Ligand binder design. Structure first.
Ligand code: MG
Ligand code: MG
Ligand code: MG
Ligand code: MG
Ligand code: MG
Ligand code: MG
Ligand code: MG
Ligand code: MG
Ligand code: MG
Ligand code: MG
Ligand code: MG
Ligand code: MG
Lengths: 243, 45, 117, 95, 95, 76, 240
RNA sequence: GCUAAACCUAGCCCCAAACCCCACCUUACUACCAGACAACCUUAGCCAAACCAUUUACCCAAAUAAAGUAUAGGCGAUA
RNA sequence: GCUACCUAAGAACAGCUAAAAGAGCACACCCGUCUAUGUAGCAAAAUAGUGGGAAGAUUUAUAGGUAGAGGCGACAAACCUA
RNA sequence: CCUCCGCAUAAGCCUGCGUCAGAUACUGACAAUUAACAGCCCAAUAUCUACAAUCAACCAACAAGUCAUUA
RNA sequence: GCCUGUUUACCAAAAACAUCACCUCUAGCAUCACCAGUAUUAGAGGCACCGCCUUCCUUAAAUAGGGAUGGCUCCACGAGGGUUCAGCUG
RNA sequence: UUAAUUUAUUAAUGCAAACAACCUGCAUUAAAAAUUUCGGUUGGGGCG
């Protein structure tokens, strides 16, 4: 027989069912939407069309991303979209030679970063690319708040994003307590990234974490039927008395 | 001389092919899953 | 080599045969020297009523009239047990009517059930 | 960062379709390793006097190592962002 | 050759044939002579003249090439200034 | 020379999830699930109090707190 | 494999410890060292190789009484149960150490050279040049690691600045801070060389087993060979 | 005339449509004590190339057509 | 769960001779020299006699470990469920 | 007339010559192995424990031999 | 072949492998093997205990047997491989 | 194996990278390997 739906649509169908359906709409949209990460390990084509020299004709060109492997250690650090390149090479760089398995790994450093919004220093395993990205963003907080999930590619990065966004959304006085002017200065500096707290609560959550959060939100010990029946009987008696 | 390679002992049988040892590794879990898919009456030993 | 027969306590070596039971609920514990201490409270005490003068019998006369099955429900129990008092006190704090906020503190807790049968 | 390139060209996938990769498309050649590029300089605005660099409010091109290890972590300098440049310009014109 | 491709189920063209032979529409195949560019300094002028010529193929060679190419290569092409336009057709041929 | 090789010493607990280092947010742990899952944060369980009290599951207090403990060391 | 090292005891003790044989096997269960297996069951006596270990709430040089000198199954040297103050410990016995002898363990680097009596431990700075020593540390307080086998004896070759040159029994020179402690004299059981095993069974008792396939590389053992250079290829195997 | 011989539905195949009490991870099916190990990481090769060594189609997210075309390729098998 | 090696903790080894023994003769036990039988056999390696060892580098029960280009091997390319 | 046989434990097996009724130690039904033997243990924390065995007394050694208790 | 042992489970038990003994090579050192060891140690390879010096006879007939760093020395042992006296025997 | 092809992996170095350790990339040399082959004629083989 045949399945009614293609097997690759089964995850989407599951998302449209059960507790995953009760998940908030903005989070579901964030999961569903997929954007290609910024090129890191390959040089993108300049344009969509190119004059190939062999025949001098205008041919379409596409940027096919290199498959990158992110070891679980990366989720505890901030690699600027950089990861392991698991691929193959031709020995001596000629196709008529042997084909060898080759793994390119990034150079990882341990660095300490201070987050203004969190008023905390984090020691993070990092790459030179991540340092450059932080410099381009003018600080760790800006880098975390600007970089989308795909380019950030770090569970720790997305947790930092959620923390900063929650801090901004709540305007939490725990940021430099006893220094309200400094706290307001920080919030004003990072004002443009502020989002509603109901949305910031779900930023960077994996699907399983979001399911657990929703289950905790909607878990309620059942109301005893005594209370329901008492309320119903009192309402009915009120109606009878009025009529 | 040969043929009696089976020298039974329930301790060895359970420790070698039992449910707990099967579940102790992902490969053995897939063993049990294959037996369940086939419909084996005896999943483990 | 027998994969199909049920695993019982009759099958393994001495340690296996001693360790496995037959479903009987535990009655106590084992101390040093394998001395078994039997806890009285762990032993199910049969609460057998006095049947002297009881009129009901194992069977019912066929002369009894037929009736329609009406399984008891929470709504029916509330109506027949709480609704009268509720009405009489409303015409004139739910613990007075029987409701208890929590089962903790009771001997026979309804959930999680902590009594036999 | 290691930058690689396919030896074998990938056929065009289309508009909404995704490219289909085969065994030969996993063969890469290293076109460049960014770590071997010549070092560039970081633009920073100083906040406190620092020996042999500057005093305060002056844009300085410092080695990235110094900028990221000493100046910025210790607060001796701030990123040369447009906002920081504007603030220090107002400071200069108010002095 | 591939009689049924794995992606379309179609018959494939041996591109080695296309890179080497010209098909006149009537069914004639034209080719260059082997070695026409090789070691010309040691070849007599008559041999070089023979080698510089465009030459027809056998009936069986033509049949093989027809089998090795698909119908696309056997169509009428109305190129602008094709040097072989006059040769694309046969005239005054008896059987 | 120290006695007791590392491989026999008690294994160091796994590093805490980075989610616990971020001040403003409550980590999502498998405490609510009442069982371990590998894709959720590991809960920080408060120490359990009713444990070392039952006679058959008793833990003696440290020697310092015993009634007859004395700073002067007798030789028995 | 479910291998846990037997070396799990944390507190020093005089009681011999039940040690598990390895058979030459890793924690992975595969043979790592060949030729090991079986032999007489042995108990391990924890040796205190830090001779200058003043007792708790105590300090300074201390003396110790040699309770006894015993054969040790786990060593070529025989060991000495030695007691000081209110503690007992196993140490490596020197050549002429006897029951009832007295041993000095000092950390005092005297300005003059201390009279080197066999068996006592002094910092290498305090010993005369040319004295025979054993149980030599590499760093101050590290614990003895060198010159520990039966009958071995290094020589205090030189002392300059805070550094002493020791001649190890392999006749190799070693540089050690003069504050590191060593004991005077040669290690006991000096006749360990002259012992004749006599029969294969005695080695089997000692726990050495005949083992083959000791290399596990393709082709087994292969001695190193000189690979000729291209100019020399013409003369490698000149026929007669 | 023995052994046999015969039978027709038990079901199955391909489509379409539709999205589908108690016990038991310890020696499973075992009422009832100090956890913490908790997962992630290119398929390879057969085979074709009449050997083989680069190479040799493989759930793709609209069929058809463009088109076995452009391209790729020990520029060859083939893709 | 055979076998090879190893780990933990067991067990067995009469009698005589000799005297603390990889000692002698020789039971149990282990093996397998030679011969015969058997050769779809009792047996996919057995039987009978003979023979070697038999307090040791011995034999052996139990549980555990090492896994396939790997293990293990007192090297026979031996053994790792005929 | 014959037997390194037998009886027990272990391990293994799992009702596999008990009774009855039908068949030619098979089928079905009914029955049965009763704990003292054996297994299933220990409330912990600390701290303790050099001194073999071999009739363990002499003699004899080397291959140096778990015995874990107490406040 | 020093010896006791080991081996081709199922055609080879041996002179083969191991083995004490000796030689060579490698390694100056800690918390999972080696090793809770430390050059009189550990790992690997070789070699072989040890010790020393540097034509005749047999039969009557005998292709059989025995005798006139290496070279040597066989104490003992062997279901090893040859030869022999005597005896015994279908 | 002094057949051909490699060095992916380890081990050394060297150069860059991160400021000695550790680690990444690129080279060179080895170890260990890996993959693959065995033209034709002459009774066979050697040398031809
Ligand atoms: Mg067995
Ligand atoms: Mg298209
Ligand atoms: Mg082929
Ligand atoms: Mg005897
Ligand atoms: Mg003997
Ligand atoms: Mg063996
Ligand atoms: Mg051989
Ligand atoms: Mg021999
Ligand atoms: Mg022998
Ligand atoms: Mg054989
Ligand atoms: Mg034989
Ligand atoms: Mg003869």
């Amino acid at each position: 027989p045949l399945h009614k739906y293609p097997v690759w649509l089964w995850k989407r169908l599951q998302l449209r069912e059960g507790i995953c359906s009760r998940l908030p709409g903005h989070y579901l949209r964030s999961l569903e939407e997929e954007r290609t990460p910024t090129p890191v390990h390959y040089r993108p084509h300049g344009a969509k069309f190119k004059i190939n020299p062999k025949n001098g004709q205008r041919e379409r060109v596409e940027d096919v991303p290199i498959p990158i492997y992110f070891p679980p250690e990366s989720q505890r650090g901030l690699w600027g979209g950089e990861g392991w390149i698991l691929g193959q090479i031709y020995a001596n760089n000629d196709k008529l030679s042997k084909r060898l398995k080759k793994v390119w790994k990034p150079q990882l450093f341990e660095r300490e970063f201070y987050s203004e919004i969190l008023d905390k220093k984090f020691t993070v395993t990092v790459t030179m690319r991540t340092l450059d990205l932080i410099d381009e963003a003018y600080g760790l907080d800006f880098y975390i708040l600007k970089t989308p999930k795909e380019d950030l590619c770090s569970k720790f990065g997305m947790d930092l994003k959620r923390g900063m966004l929650l801090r901004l959304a709540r305007q939490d006085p725990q940021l430099h307590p006893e220094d309200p002017e400094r706290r307001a200065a920080i919030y004003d500096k990072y004002k443009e990234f502020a989002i509603p707290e109901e949305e910031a609560e779900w930023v960077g959550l994996t699907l399983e974490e979001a399911i657990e959060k929703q289950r905790l939100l909607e878990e309620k010990d059942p109301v005893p039927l005594f209370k329901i029946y008492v309320a119903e009987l009192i309402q009915q008696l009120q109606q009878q008395a009025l009529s | 001389a040969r043929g009696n390679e089976y020298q039974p002992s329930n301790i060895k049988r359970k420790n070698k092919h039992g449910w707990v040892r099967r579940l102790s590794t992902p490969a053995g879990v897939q063993v049990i899953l294959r037996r369940m898919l086939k419909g084996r009456k005896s999943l483990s030993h | 080599a027998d994969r199909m027969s049920k695993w019982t306590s009759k099958r393994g070596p001495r340690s296996f045969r001693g360790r496995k039971g037959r479903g009987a609920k535990g009655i106590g514990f084992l101390t040093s020297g394998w001395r078994f201490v039997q806890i009285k409270e762990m032993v199910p005490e049969f609460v057998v009523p006095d049947l002297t003068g009881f009129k009901l019998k194992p069977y019912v006369s066929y002369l009894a009239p037929e009736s329609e099955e009406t399984p008891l429900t929470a709504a029916q129990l509330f109506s027949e047990a709480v609704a009268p008092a509720i009405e009489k006190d409303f015409k004139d704090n739910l613990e007075k009517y029987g409701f208890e906020p929590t089962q903790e503190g009771k001997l026979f807790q309804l959930y999680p059930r902590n009594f036999l049968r | 960062t290691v930058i690689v390139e396919r030896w074998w060209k990938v056929p065009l996938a289309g508009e909404g379709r995704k490219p289909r990769l085969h065994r030969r498309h996993r063969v890469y050649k290293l076109v460049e390793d960014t770590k071997h590029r010549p070092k560039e300089n970081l633009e920073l605005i100083l906040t406190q006097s620092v020996e042999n660099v500057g005093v305060r409010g002056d844009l300085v091109s410092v080695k990235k190592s110094l900028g990221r290890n000493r100046l910025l972590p210790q607060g001796l300098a701030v990123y040369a962002s447009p906002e920081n440049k504007k603030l220090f310009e107002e400071e200069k014109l108010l002095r | 050759l591939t009689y049924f491709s794995a992606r379309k189920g179609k018959r494939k063209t041996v591109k080695a044939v296309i890179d080497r032979f010209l098909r006149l529409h009537c069914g004639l195949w034209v080719r260059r002579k082997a070695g026409y560019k090789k070691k010309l300094w040691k070849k007599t002028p008559a041999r070089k003249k023979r080698l510089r010529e465009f030459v027809f193929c056998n009936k069986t060679q033509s049949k093989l090439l027809d089998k090795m190419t698909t119908s696309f290569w056997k169509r009428r092409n109305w190129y602008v200034d094709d040097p072989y336009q006059k040769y694309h057709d046969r005239t005054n041929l008896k059987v | 020379y120290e006695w007791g090789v590392r491989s026999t010493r008690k294994s160091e607990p796994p590093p805490l999830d980075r989610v616990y280092e971020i001040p403003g947010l409550e980590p999502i742990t498998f405490a609510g699930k009442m069982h371990f899952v590998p894709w959720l944060a590991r809960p920080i369980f408060p120490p359990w109090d009713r444990g070392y009290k039952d006679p058959r599951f008793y833990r003696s207090p440290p020697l310092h707190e015993h009634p007859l403990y004395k700073d002067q060391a007798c030789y028995i | 494999a479910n291998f846990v090292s037997w070396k799990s005891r944390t507190k020093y003790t005089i009681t011999p410890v039940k040690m598990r044989k390895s058979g030459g096997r890793d924690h992975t269960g595969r043979i790592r060292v060949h030729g090991i297996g079986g032999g007489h069951k042995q108990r391990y006596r924890m040796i205190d190789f830090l001779r200058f270990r003043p007792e708790e709430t105590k300090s300074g040089p201390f003396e110790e009484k040699v309770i006894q000198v015993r054969y040790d199954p786990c060593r070529s040297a025989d060991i000495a149960l030695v007691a000081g103050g209110s503690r007992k410990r196993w140490i490596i016995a020197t050549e002429n150490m006897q029951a009832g002898d007295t041993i000095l363990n000092s950390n005092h680097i005297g300005r003059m050279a201390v009279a080197a009596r066999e068996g006592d431990a002094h910092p290498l700075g305090a010993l005369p040049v040319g004295t025979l020593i054993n149980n030599v540390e590499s760093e101050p307080g590290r614990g003895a690691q060198y010159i520990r086998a039966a009958g071995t004896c290094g020589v205090l070759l030189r002392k300059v600045n805070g550094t002493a040159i020791i001649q190890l029994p392999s006749k190799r020179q070693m540089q050690v801070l003069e504050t590191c402690v060593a004991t005077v004299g040669r290690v006991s059981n000096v006749d360990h060389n002259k012992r004749v095993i006599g029969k294969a069974g005695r080695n089997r008792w000692l726990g050495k087993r005949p083992n083959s396939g000791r290399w596990h590389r393709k082709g087994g053992w292969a001695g190193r060979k000189i690979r000729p250079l291209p100019p020399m290829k013409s003369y490698v195997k000149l026929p007669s």
